Design a protein around this ligand. Structure first.
Ligand SMILES: *[C@@H]1O[C@H](CO)[C@@H](O[C@@H]2O[C@H](CO)[C@@H](O[C@@H]3O[C@H](CO[C@H]4O[C@H](CO)[C@@H](O)[C@H](O[C@H]5O[C@H](CO)[C@@H](O)[C@H](O)[C@@H]5O[C@H]5O[C@H](CO)[C@@H](O)[C@H](O)[C@@H]5O)[C@@H]4O)[C@@H](O)[C@H](O[C@H]4O[C@H](CO)[C@@H](O)[C@H](O)[C@@H]4O[C@H]4O[C@H](CO)[C@@H](O)[C@H](O)[C@@H]4O)[C@@H]3O)[C@H](O)[C@H]2NC(C)=O)[C@H](O)[C@H]1NC(C)=O
Ligand SMILES: Cc1cc(OCc2n[nH]c(=O)n2C)c(-c2cc(C(=O)N3CCN(C)C(=O)C3)ccc2F)cc1Cl
Ligand SMILES: [Ca+2]
Ligand SMILES: [Ca+2]
Ligand SMILES: [Cl-]
Ligand SMILES: [K+]
Ligand code: NA
Ligand SMILES: [Zn+2]
Length: 798
């Protein structure tokens, strides 16, 4: 019954039953009676024409061509072009913006986030001819060839990750559809529940801004508000007095995604939606230019995810695998999440569901996982809203429970939601404005990094998040964030020879000159350490007790608590040779006379444990000499490994490391165990360990990592590199079977590398999982090193 007069798109939202004129009033059925009439004017459309110039202001018109419109801030965006003989922003040469050029009274450059739904990364190249405004932003500002979304590659998880800097498992929007068993409530795209505040965790940019005195415009736009009105509203807000004007704004377009679903990512129908988005960008930039804000505002052009070809004939049906299909609830589509239809069903067994879904058809287009066994790079486990059973669906496919679900609801030709390394899921980033660099291309990066940068652009302190603050400094002309390396918490001991062989009772056996004798002592004292520890030792960022152990071919930081290395570091040159394990050493394990029997593993435990065997972190295959090979059989280089995993590990060590050393001109490798029994992506304390080698205190890792570093300029060997580095890493699941690899009965050359690629990782992922900090001593700037630590090698083509 109240009125919207003078309150159109009010930023502060009024408490019902007072009627609301804020954006979200439509989404709640609560708009004042005159909302449409006052706030959604459309009369005479969206452009000035020659005859409208200098008209008398008519308040019914969608936008204005009257002389007073600029001061009022509500001209049609083409007003100066049509009426004052100005040029469209897109027709102007670009000129470097070295400093903000803002009207007096602006305390900081405003930020406009221009978000576009389903804008696949390759549209920047493929649609360049039909998008001149976007192409000007891209070539004049700072751009990446693509930006990596989070998993699942759906809208709300990705947009709320942009808003918060958090993985979906931490912010809580883990899908477009969710069941929370604590609330016993469901979240759906359609409907009311999704507005409840208890779904949305972390602290989004608009709250961060507000808490720190920076005003924010709306981020969420009702679908029925036309795009032109969203633009004109932003432009209106920017004309507000200093004390009311927001400093951060978002625009959102549901295109190209909406058409992409109907026509496929490159259907011929897709050209028009791309033209329309470009026209809207043009309206914004012309509107900014009229307000003399086009060299003041920082603009971010960003997508949430891309779009893949998906049709309803590419659907896998669980009813083809499960006899019990009606006892489960499936969240379906480009991912699958399974739980019991009824929690009173005591018969429901997830292990047998997984078994029935595992490698059952030769070209099966989905793979089942317990969530803790998903590639750690997905960070998709630590939330009660993520079901225990997950299906990773092949790109281009869908999963559904029963054929009825798909034909009782081939309309669509496009979908998204797949693994976030899939090329078709990649999206876009362009930054344009005084705070961004000029004509600069930056490498691809993950959208979890953007919240920190948007905070930097606004002078805000970011809430704790999953970005690595400083890793995106190379996008910025100024306002860079200059972090300090975390302080080492535990200093190592450097044990010398302290124990006689006969003090060890380990059930371990091994069939075991003064020039060469001073020689071996110097190696044990760290004489080759500069060859094998190229970037300094890792820093231990938690309280523990550990020892540095030096050897000819490798150095290790040995944990007295976990009875194995936290890390083992070694360098393999291009010329290095692979040798075999000599017969007299096949089951040799040697006591390490620097490390007490009581802080050592023992062979008897492995003998007793019928499921568990052991491997080595530094591979004996790569020893530099027959004498150095004995070091690789030290009990302090041994780690527990299931026989099934040893097939993976042996192939990596015997074949792949040497191959990488040939291809990259030497590699430095750091390997070690990871313990993440509660799947939170973070280092377990010793009291979280769920499994031990039978009858011992030897803890069983959930994963094994390796970080493989070389020179980015591969004409320089890894050990003599002058400039930037190149890295690939993995976090391999330490599993007692190879059920994840359907071809594992074949030779390791047909399936191990594929497994490793699936479990590619960032160094930063390994850092969270181990509590270590790598690359402490390089000649590189720290921000460059933070970019390196966030790098992910995806193994996708161009
Ligand atoms: C990515 O970045 C994020 C952000 O930095 C990292 O997440 C942080 O991880 C921290 C370490 O795990 C975690 O710290 C805990 O916080 C507890 C207090 O939490 C509340 O308050 C904060 C601050 O405002 C808030 O952010 C939290 O929000 C979470 O929970 C709500 C409601 O459930 C959600 O809406 C929201 O989405 C978010 O959920 C996520 O986090 C929780 C865990 O906090 C998950 O369970 C969810 O699945 C989801 O992922 C909260 O509202 C605090 O109580 C904890 O302290 C316990 O542990 C310490 C150890 O030092 C112990 O000393 C304390 O006494 C306490 O133990 C007691 O409780 C134990 C558990 O119940 C019990 O076992 C003991 O016996 C003790 O009595 C802890 O400090 C921090 O909350 C999150 N923050 C966020 C936003 O997620 C994340 O790790 C990064 N990821 C990676 C891979 O790096
Ligand atoms: C660029 C961007 C755009 C955003 O939305 C654009 C949009 N408009 N219309 C439409 O369908 N979409 C997708 C969002 C976004 C904001 C909210 C919100 O605003 N929230 C959440 C908590 N709840 C409970 C709130 O009160 C506020 C919710 C979901 C979001 F995706 C975030 C960013 Cl960073
Ligand atoms: Ca979307
Ligand atoms: Ca953990
Ligand atoms: Cl979902
Ligand atoms: K055994
Ligand atoms: Na297998
Ligand atoms: Zn979509």
């Amino acid at each position: 019954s109240g009125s919207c007069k003078g309150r159109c798109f009010e930023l502060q939202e009024v408490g019902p039953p007072d009627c609301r004129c804020d954006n979200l009033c439509k989404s709640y059925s609560s708009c004042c009676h005159d909302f449409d009439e006052l706030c959604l004017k459309t009369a005479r459309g969206w452009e000035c024409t020659k005859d409208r110039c200098g008209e008398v202001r008519n308040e019914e018109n969608a936008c204005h061509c009257s002389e007073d419109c600029l001061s009022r801030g509500d001209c049609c965006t083409n007003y100066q072009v049509v009426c004052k003989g100005e040029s469209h922003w897109v027709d102007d040469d670009c000129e470097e913006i070295k400093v903000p050029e803002c009207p007096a009274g602006f305390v900081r450059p405003p930020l406009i986030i221009f978000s576009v739904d389903g804008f696949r990364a390759s549209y920047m190249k493929k649609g360049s001819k039909v998008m001149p405004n976007i192409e000007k932003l891209r070539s004049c500002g700072t751009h990446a060839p693509y930006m990596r979304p989070v998993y699942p590659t759906k809208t709300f998880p990705n947009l709320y990750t942009l808003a918060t800097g958090l993985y979906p498992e931490s912010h809580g929007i883990v899908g477009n559809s969710m069941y929370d068993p604590v609330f016993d409530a469901s979240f759906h795209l359609r409907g009311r529940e999704k507005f409840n505040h208890r779904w949305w965790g972390g602290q989004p940019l608009w709250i961060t801004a507000t808490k720190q005195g920076v005003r924010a415009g709306t981020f969420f736009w009702s679908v029925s508000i036309p795009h032109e009105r969203r633009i004109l509203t932003i432009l209106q807000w920017l004309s507000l007095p200093d004390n009311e004007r927001p400093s951060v704004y978002a625009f959102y377009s549901e295109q190209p995604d909406f058409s992409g679903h109907k026509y496929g990512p490159f259907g011929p129908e897709m050209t028009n939606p791309l033209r329309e988005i470009d026209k809207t960008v043009g309206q914004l930039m012309d509107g900014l230019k009229q307000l003399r804000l086009h060299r003041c505002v920082n603009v971010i052009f960003v997508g949430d995810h891309g779009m893949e070809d998906v049709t309803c004939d590419r659907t896998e049906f669980l009813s083809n695998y499960l006899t019990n299909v009606d006892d489960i609830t499936l969240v379906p589509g480009t991912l699958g999440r399974i739980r019991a239809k009824s929690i009173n069903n005591s018969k429901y067994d997830p292990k047998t569901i997984i078994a029935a879904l595992t490698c059952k058809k030769p070209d099966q287009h989905f793979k089942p996982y317990m969530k803790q066994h998903l590639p750690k790079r997905l960070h998709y486990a630590n939330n009660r809203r993520i079901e225990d059973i997950h299906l990773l669906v092949d790109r281009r496919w869908h999963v559904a429970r029963k054929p009825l679900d798909v034909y009782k609801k081939c309309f669509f030709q496009g979908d998204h939601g797949f693994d976030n390394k899939v090329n078709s899921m990649q999206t876009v980033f362009v930054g344009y404005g005084p705070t961004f660099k000029y004509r600069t291309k930056v490498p691809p990066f993950e959208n979890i990094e953007l919240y920190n940068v948007m905070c930097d652009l606004l002078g805000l302190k970011p809430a704790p998040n999953n970005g690595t603050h400083g890793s995106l400094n190379h996008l910025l002309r100024t306002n860079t964030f200059r972090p300090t390396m975390p302080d080492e918490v535990s200093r190592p001991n450097y044990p010398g020879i302290m124990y006689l062989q006969s003090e060890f009772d380990l059930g371990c056996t091994c069939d075991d000159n003064k020039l060469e004798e001073l020689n071996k002592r110097l190696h044990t004292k760290g004489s080759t350490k500069e060859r094998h520890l190229l970037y300094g030792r890792p820093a231990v960022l938690y309280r523990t007790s550990y020892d540095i152990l030096y050897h000819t071919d490798f150095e290790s930081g040995y944990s007295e608590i976990f009875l194995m290395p936290l890390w083992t570091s070694y360098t393999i040159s291009k010329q290095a040779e692979v040798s075999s394990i000599p017969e007299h050493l096949t089951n040799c394990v040697r006591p390490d006379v620097r490390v007490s029997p009581g802080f050592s593993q023992n062979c008897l435990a492995y003998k007793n444990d019928k499921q568990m065997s052991y491997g080595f972190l530094f591979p004996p295959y790569l020893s530099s000499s027959p004498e150095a090979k004995y070091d690789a059989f030290l009990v302090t280089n041994m780690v527990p490994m299931y026989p099934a995993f040893k097939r993976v590990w042996a192939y990596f060590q015997r074949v792949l490391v040497k191959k990488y050393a040939s291809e990259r001109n030497g590699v430095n490798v750091i390997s070690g165990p990871i313990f993440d029994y509660n799947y939170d992506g973070l280092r377990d304390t010793e009291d979280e360990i769920k499994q031990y080698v039978e009858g011992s205190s030897i803890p069983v890792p959930t994963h094994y990592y390796s970080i493989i570093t070389s020179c980015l300029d591969f004409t320089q060997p890894a050990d003599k590199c002058d400039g930037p580095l190149s890295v690939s890493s993995f976090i391999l699941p330490h599993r007692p079977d190879n059920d994840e690899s359907c071809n594992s009965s074949e030779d390791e050359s047909k399936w191990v590398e594929e497994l490793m690629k699936m479990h590619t990782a960032r160094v930063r992922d390994i850092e969270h999982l181990t509590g270590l900090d790598f690359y402490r001593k390089t000649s590189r700037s720290y921000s460059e090193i933070l970019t390196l630590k966030t790098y992910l090698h995806t193994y996708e083509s161009e």
